[PDB]
Amino acid sequence: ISGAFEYSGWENFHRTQWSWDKKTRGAHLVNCTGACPHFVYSKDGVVMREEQSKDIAPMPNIPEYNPRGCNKGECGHDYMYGPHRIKYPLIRVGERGEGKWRRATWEEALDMIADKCVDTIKNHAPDCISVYSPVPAVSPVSFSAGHRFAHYIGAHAHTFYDWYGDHPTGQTQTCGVQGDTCETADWFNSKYIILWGSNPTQTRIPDAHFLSEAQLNGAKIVSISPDYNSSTIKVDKWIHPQPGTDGALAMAMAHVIIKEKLYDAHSLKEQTDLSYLVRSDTKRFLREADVVAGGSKDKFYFWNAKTGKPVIPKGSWGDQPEKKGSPVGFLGRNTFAFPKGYIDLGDLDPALEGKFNMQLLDGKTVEVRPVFEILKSRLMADNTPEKAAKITGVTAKAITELAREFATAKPSMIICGGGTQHWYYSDVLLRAMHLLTALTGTEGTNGGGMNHYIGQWKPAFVAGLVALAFPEGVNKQRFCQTTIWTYIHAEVNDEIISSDIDTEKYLRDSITTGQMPNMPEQGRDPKVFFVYRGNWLNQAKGQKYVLENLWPKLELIVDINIRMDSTALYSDVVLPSAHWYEKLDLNVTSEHSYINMTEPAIKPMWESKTDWQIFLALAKRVEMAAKRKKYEKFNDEKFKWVRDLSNLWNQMTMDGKLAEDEAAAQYILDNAPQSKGITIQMLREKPQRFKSNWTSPLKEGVPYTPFQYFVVDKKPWPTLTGRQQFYLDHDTFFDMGVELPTYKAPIDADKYPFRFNSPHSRHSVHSTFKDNVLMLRLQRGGPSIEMSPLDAKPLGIKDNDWVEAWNNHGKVICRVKIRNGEQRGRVSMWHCPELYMDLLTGGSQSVCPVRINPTNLVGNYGHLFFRPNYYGPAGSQRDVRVNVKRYIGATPISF
Amino acid sequence: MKAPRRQLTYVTDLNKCIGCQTCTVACKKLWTTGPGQDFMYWRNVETAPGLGYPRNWQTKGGGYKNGELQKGKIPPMIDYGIPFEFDYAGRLFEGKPGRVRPSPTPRSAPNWDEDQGAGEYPNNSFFYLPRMCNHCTKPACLEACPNEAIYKREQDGIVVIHQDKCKGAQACVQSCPYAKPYFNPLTNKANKCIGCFPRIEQGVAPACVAQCVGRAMHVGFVDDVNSSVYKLIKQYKVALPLHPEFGTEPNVFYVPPVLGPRIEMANGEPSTDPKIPLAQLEGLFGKQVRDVLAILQSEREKKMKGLASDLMDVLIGRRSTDMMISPLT
Ligand SMILES: Nc1nc2c(c(=O)[nH]1)N[C@@H](/C(S)=C(/S)[C@H](O)COP(=O)(O)OP(=O)(O)OC[C@H]1O[C@@H](n3cnc4c(=O)[nH]c(N)nc43)[C@H](O)[C@@H]1O)C=N2
Ligand SMILES: Nc1nc2c(c(=O)[nH]1)N[C@H]1C(S)=C(S)[C@@H](COP(=O)(O)OP(=O)(O)OC[C@H]3O[C@@H](n4cnc5c(=O)[nH]c(N)nc54)[C@H](O)[C@@H]3O)O[C@H]1N2
Ligand code: SF4
Ligand code: SF4
Ligand code: SF4
Ligand code: SF4
Ligand code: F3S
Ligand SMILES: O=S([O-])[O-]
Ligand SMILES: O=[Se]([O-])O
Ligand SMILES: [Mo]
Ligand code: NA
Ligand code: NA
Ligand code: NA
Ligand SMILES: [Zn+2]
CATH class of the missing domain: 2.20.25 (N-terminal domain of TfIIb)
Structure with missing residues (x-):
């Protein structure tokens, strides 16, 4: 048996x-x-x-x-x-967006694109061609294909980090880095976490367990969010302010912390600029140039309270190192070149309070105060709990208790996200959150710090990527700043009148002084647009401006995709890209420290090709086209570069070395310190941890936490001052009233009564999976917009009724979900459902303009300069307001 | 009958479930992608309070009353939700105009009332309730079947509907008070959760446990005194069966939520009461809920004072294999 x-x-x-x-x-x-x-x-x-x-x-x-x-x-x-798959190359035959196609061969498709690319270069300028492909960390090889293509033919690239509103603008202002953050495992080390505009139950699903596990291990957690969100059901305390008023909350916490002396003075003195000296007359930093003939305009003073004399702090912009290192993309300047111990306080005792007099070069005498002194005075006056209570609607008691707890529990940390980062004034708000961290001294400690989470922006092996995508150098590559590019070319109306904020003047002056780029040059129109690995039209702010003004300037729009998304649906040529499980690529993120990858399970399906293979195939047809059109080689005076189109393929593949996807993937691993040593085979078997990281040591058995090279090794912060800089004494910052962290109320230029919130859903990854049949069956079969019952009842609106939301920019009609946990006075629409889904008109981006905060255009102030995805205007959208009403063309009954 | 030699046992930590539906998806793509099964979610996750899936299942009837087998209702298809269907081809590829609407007109669906729960701002409350077949020690479904198509596996206590023995009598659907057997109108067979016995037989945790992203699921044999399920159920006694009054004696247990913020008073200040009403939990799990919560809050407080709590360590589950039969496959 x-x-x-x-x-x-x-x-x-x-x-x-x-x-x-x-x-x-x-x-x-x-x-x-x-x-x-x-x-x-x-x-x-x-x-x-x-x-x-x-x-x-x-x-x-x-x-x-x-x-x-x-x-x-x-x-x-x-x-x-699924029913969404692109199987064959498609060329449009009806109007853009109709979904009327004819099947073409790869030859015909790629030849059409090649013909147009050569003509455009020949007849206009190479910079009238552009490639949009975001977030290289998601799939570095696929990202590198289009970018290497553009790199050799002279097309320009885009930015994504700031365009999406995710670049932590305030942290770059404060710390002089592109950004950094702890890996989520470090959350488990904290005793006190503030979830500040972050909904990780829905938006950090694979990592959220660390939070509830921290709590069960004894941590306390606070949720700060206008609506009672999904995350909030598990936290210990819930704070619910008016939208975009978080700045007032944070400054009032700073006030309490300072007035009650709950802060780390030693840390403030060593690591920030709060001791640096400010002239009472010009309200600028006292500089060495002011005092000494031929003195640096980038060296400063603090008052040493143990010797009763002024002292030049070490490590600022004017202090040069030793041996100078190469530029490091995610730093203002390579301050790693300095020696360990360099900015150690030693026995210095920088003053934080008082007034002092000093004698200028010209002999006259000026009163000076340390930043902290100015900050402290202003906080005692303007940012009491009682005043902040009136603004935010949070009680003065709550604000005080939050303040004390945040400063007493150790380690404490802030976790911020879209809710606090996607606002017009998010830069000043993050400076304020960084002020709170600095005051409590938790930066660079496990379980501490100011930790931002958003999208998949960080690729630790970034030099290996730059090697494959931009092999002649980043300095020999065209970049636009996408927020500016959209604003200008889609001819956006931001509704902000010039006499309030002269957006136009700042923008124009920033460009003609070379602080910010403008592509194409000489006022030419963009003519050719490659879009892949991002649903750029669907997700674009100012979408109605884009469809009406920018789209028709484009002679050829090419979408390369696994599926027919809205961008592709509105394109001229759509090419079939191999699925994730039919391709080879690396896959990494900032949330964890390990290298993921995908490999083919089966051969690319139908006539689909991998992104690497597509731009390789294009390169040949472009060689051919260039020969036909007798335009094989041309000068490119911007880079003093004579380009040879007849050798594009060999350029793409480094004379055939990188013609297979796997060689391109390995080329990346080989060319970064974080990854060199790792093979595709190793990764194929098991995820490998990065060999090193960015601004801290990467240590065995210990979660990464950023900025330790400055906090621990006392290397200077890559800022103008060489510290965590809370005083930014640039003209544009005074203009906006933001030389110091302080509360800036949200833009109300939309003269409509509901604030428009557009958070990310557990049911999709951006537009991808929006149209997935199973995902839709676990909802209500289509896109959704949420309203409080207190706003819906007077409007005659019932749960699941159609509703209409509009402002001067556009209009959207979407079925409503009435939810008690939503705050009255606002509506929430899960961001960017696809245009072709269950909407009677428009989409979430129809009611959003593109807006540009002037402080984000500053490009001539130390660490504030343009570098793609390092600094640039954020595409904020949370200040948007709309009106809402019941749609009456269809009122179905329920049962 | 014949009692099983061992009994596969689940513990669901309502402190940790984030309602991501990953487990719902994994089970569907593994076992219910067949003909007639589109409306079936052997594993589902509902917002509590809410209608559940199928709508108002908690009053459908079934189970036992003083030992007497009960015959409950057979839910109509609309209480499950007609699975929405779409014509993407026409709009994306064929030039048909018009939005890719769902058919039918949305009126009901398994997760229709997600995150709505109960209470007015700022005291709105809800949490997530994952559900499955409970592989009951007293399976109502099994007694009710006039064809003896439903059997309880001797080796692991898993209850299974034998598809060849089944003639579509639907007594089981009437009698399960959890509404977990689903009548397949195409094949004329009842279908339900198979406790992933093929994975269990290979020493792999069920999919809704191994793939649980919130790390809220525990599985093991309750006779193993070193298992997290024995520890939570028998030792610390903090895991309760859902609706015990149904009299089926489930073998799926719940750790009730103790995490959560306080009721906000009219002056904006915290009460001592949780936003989750005790009365709601007692409704789900009976009168033991108070004492379980006191234990959970007491142990969490030791961790807060930097003291040791082994019960908390169990819920934390720093290693998955401390929570479950190996998830590796
Ligand atoms: N009001 C409001 N507006 C907002 C936001 C908001 O919060 N509120 N959020 C922002 C933010 S933060 C982001 S990150 C954008 O939504 C990101 O959109 P994205 O187009 O990159 O993702 P998406 O998933 O949609 O597009 C991915 C595309 O790439 C396809 N795809 C995916 N993988 C591949 C691949 O391997 N190769 C190729 N060639 N294509 C691939 C994918 O099908 C989809 O079309 C923006 N707007
Ligand atoms: N499942 C899923 N996860 C995702 C994504 C996805 O598409 N699907 N997208 C990823 C990416 S790229 C993004 S950028 C992130 C975004 O995800 P999150 O960083 O979590 O940010 P949001 O979803 O925009 O909103 C966060 C929460 O903050 C609230 N909040 C909104 N406005 C305010 C405010 O003014 N002040 C305060 N204190 N709170 C506010 C929202 O109502 C919401 O509850 O998620 C990433 N994670
Ligand atoms: S989509 Fe894939 S990668 Fe992104 S979170 Fe879900 S599982 Fe992890
Ligand atoms: S996967 Fe785990 S966490 Fe996500 S819903 Fe299912 S049970 Fe809750
Ligand atoms: S839950 Fe319903 S189906 Fe599963 S065993 Fe208990 S009675 Fe039978
Ligand atoms: S045990 Fe297996 S079958 Fe039963 S629900 Fe979980 S996954 Fe589906
Ligand atoms: S009662 Fe029995 S015959 Fe099939 S439908 Fe249910 S198992
Ligand atoms: O055909 S199934 O695997 O989607
Ligand atoms: O890459 Se992030 O801006 O989503
Ligand atoms: Mo993002
Ligand atoms: Na032309
Ligand atoms: Na689908
Ligand atoms: Na259609
Ligand atoms: Zn399948």
């Missing part, structure tokens, strides 16, 4: 359902910040399902990262077989 039970044989039906003959490693190459390791299961050449591989190496004493994953991810293969 078998030793088998009565019904065992029949049960073979179900065991057969869980079987496979091949198992391969997969990843989901979308902007979600998961970078979740996965296995892909195929049987008889068909992908059957995926499942978390759960094989990230644990660290001692803290929860493992495993399993990660999420609801989109476990149905990711739906986009292999």
Whole structure:
């Protein structure tokens, strides 16, 4: 006898359902910040399902990262077989957006694109061609293909970090870096976490367990959010301010902390600019130039209280190192070149309070005060709990208690996100959050610091990526700043009258002084637009301006995609890209310190090709086109570069070395310190941890936490002052009233009564998975907009009624969800459903303009200069207001 | 009957479930992608309070009353939700105008009232309730089947509807008070959760446990005194079956939520009461809920004072294999 039970044989039906003959490693190459390791299961050449591989190496004493994953991810293969797939190259035959196509061969498709690219260069300028492809960390090889293409032919690239509103503008202002953040495992080390405009139950799904686990291990957590969001059901305290008033909350906490002396004086003195001296007459930093013949305008003073004399602090912009290192993309300047110990306080005792007199070069005498003194005075006057209570609607008692708890628990940390980052004045608000961290001394400590989370912006091996995408150098590459590019070319109306904020003058002056780029040059129109790995039209702010003004300037729009998204639907040529499980690519994120990847489980389906292969194939047809059109080589005076189009393919592939996807992936690993040593084979078997990281040591068994090279190794902060700089004495900052952190009320230029909120949903990754049938079945079959019952009832609106939301920019009609946890006075629409989904007109971007805060255009003040994705205007959208009413063309009954 | 030699047992930590539906998706793409199964969610996750899936299932009837088998209702299809369907081809590829609307007109769906719950701002409250078949020690479904198509596995206590023995009598659908057997109108068979026995047989955790992203699921055999399920159920006694008064004696247990902010008073100040009403939890899990919460709050407070709490360590689950049969596959 078998030793088998009565019904065992029949049960073979179900065991057969869980079987496979091949198992391969997969990843989901979308902007979600998961970078979740996965296995892909195929049987008889068909992908059957995926499942978390759960094989990230644990660290001692803290929860493992495993399993990660999420609801989109476990149905990711739906986009292999679903009704959305691009199978063949498509050329448009009706009007843009109609979905009227004809199938073309690759030859005809790529030749059309090649003909147009050569003509455009020949007849106009190379910079009238552009490629948009965001978030290289998501899929560095695929990102590098279009970028390398553009790099050799002279097309310009775009920015994404700031365009999306995710670049932490205030942190760059404060710390002189592009950005950095702890990996989420470090949350487990904190005793006190403030979730500040962040909804990780829905927007950090694979990492959220660390939060509830921290709480069970004894941590306290605070949620700060206008609506009672999904995250908030598990926190210990919920604070609910008026939208965009968080600045007042934070400054009042600063006030309490300072007035009650709950702060780390030693830290303030060593690591910030709060001791640096300000002239009472010009309200600028006292500088060495003011006092000494031939003195630096980039060196400063503090008052040393143990010697009763002024002293020049070490490490500011004017202090040069030793040996000078190479520029490091995510730093204002390479302050790593300085020696360890360099800005150690030693036995210095910088004053934080008092007035002092000093004698100028010209002999006359000026009163000076330290920044902290000015800050303290202004806070005592303007940012009491009682005043902030009136503004935010948070009680004065609550604000005080939050303040004391934040400053007493150690470590404490702030976790901020879209809710606080996507506002016009988010730069000043993050400066304020960084002021709170600085005051409590927790920057650079495990479980501490100001930690921002948004999208998949950070690729730790960034030099290996720059090697593959921009091999002749970043300084020999055209970049626009996409927020500016959209604003100008879509001829946006921001509704901000010049006499309030002269956006036009700032923008124009920033460009003609070369602080910010403007592409194309000489006022030419953009003519050719490559879009892939981002749904740029669907997600674009000022969308109605874009469709009406920018889109028709474009002679050719090319979308390369796995699926027909809205951008592709509105394009001229659509090319079929291989699914994530039919391609090879790396996949990384800032949330965890490990290198993920995907590999082919089956050959690319239909006539689809991998992104690397597509731009390689294009390169040949462009060679051919260039020969036909007798335009093979041309001068490019901007870079003193004679380009040879007849050798584009060899340029693309480094004379054939990088013609396979895997060589391109390995080329990346080989060319960064964070990854050199790692092979594709290793990664194929198991996720590997990065060898090193950015602004801290990466230590065995310990979660990364940023900025330790400054906080611990006492290297200077890459700022003008060499510290965490809270005083920015540039003209544009005085103009806006933001030389110091302080409260800036939101833009009310939309003269409509509801604030328009557009947060991210658990049910999609941006536009991707919006149209997934299963995801839609776990909702109400289409896009949604949320209203408080207190606003819906007087308007005659019922749950699931159609509703109409509009302002001067546009209009959207969407079914409503009435939710008690929503705050009255605002509506929330889960961002950017696809245009073709269940909407009677428009989309979430129809009611959003593009707006540019002047402080984000400053490009001539130390660490504030333009570098793509380092600094630039944020595409904010949370200041938007709209009106709402019941749509009456269709009022179905319920049952 | 014949009691099983071992009993597969689940513990769901309502302190940790983030309602991401990952488990709902994983189960569907593994076992219910077949004909007639589009409306079936063997594993689902509902907002509490709410209608649940199917709508008002908690008053459908079934289970036992003083030992007497009950015959409840058979939910109509609209209480499950007609699975929405879409014509993407026409709009994206065929030049048809008009939005890709859902058919039918949306009126109901398994997760229709997500995050709505109960109470007026600023005391709105809800949490997530994952559900599955409870592989009951007293399975109502199994007794009700006039064809003896439903059996309880001797080796692991998993309850299974034998698809060849099943003739579509639907007594089981009437009698399960959890509404977890689903009548397949195409095949004329009942379908339900198979406790992932093929994975269990290979020493792999069920998919809704192994793939749980919030790290809220525990599985094991309750006879293993070193399992997290024995620890939560028998030792610390902080995990309760859902609706015990149904009399089926579930083998899926819940750790009730103790995490959560306080009721906000009219002056804006915190009360001592939680936003989640005790009365709501007692409704779900009966009169033990108060004492379980006191234990959970007491142990969490030790961790807050930097003291040791082994119960908290169990819920934390720093290693997955401390929570579950190995999830690796
Ligand atoms: N009011 C409001 N507005 C907002 C926001 C808000 O919060 N409120 N949020 C922002 C933010 S923060 C972001 S990150 C954008 O939504 C990101 O959109 P994105 O186009 O990159 O993702 P998406 O997923 O939509 O597009 C990904 C596209 O790339 C396809 N794809 C995915 N993988 C590949 C691939 O491997 N190769 C190729 N060639 N294509 C691939 C994908 O199908 C989709 O079309 C922006 N607007
Ligand atoms: N499942 C899923 N996860 C995602 C994404 C996705 O598309 N799907 N997108 C990823 C990316 S790229 C983004 S940028 C992030 C965004 O995700 P988050 O960083 O979490 O930010 P939001 O979703 O915009 O809103 C966060 C919360 O803050 C609230 N809040 C809104 N306005 C304000 C305010 O003025 N003040 C305060 N204190 N709170 C406010 C919102 O109502 C909301 O509850 O998520 C990433 N994670
Ligand atoms: S989609 Fe993003 S989050 Fe969801 S599983 Fe794939 S990678 Fe992880
Ligand atoms: S996966 Fe785990 S956490 Fe997400 S819903 Fe299912 S049970 Fe709750
Ligand atoms: S839950 Fe319903 S179906 Fe599963 S065993 Fe108990 S009674 Fe039978
Ligand atoms: S145990 Fe297996 S079958 Fe039962 S619900 Fe969880 S996944 Fe679906
Ligand atoms: S009662 Fe029995 S016959 Fe099938 S429909 Fe239910 S298992
Ligand atoms: O695997 S299924 O989607 O054909
Ligand atoms: O890459 Se982030 O701006 O989503
Ligand atoms: Mo983002
Ligand atoms: Na032309
Ligand atoms: Na689908
Ligand atoms: Na249609
Ligand atoms: Zn499938």
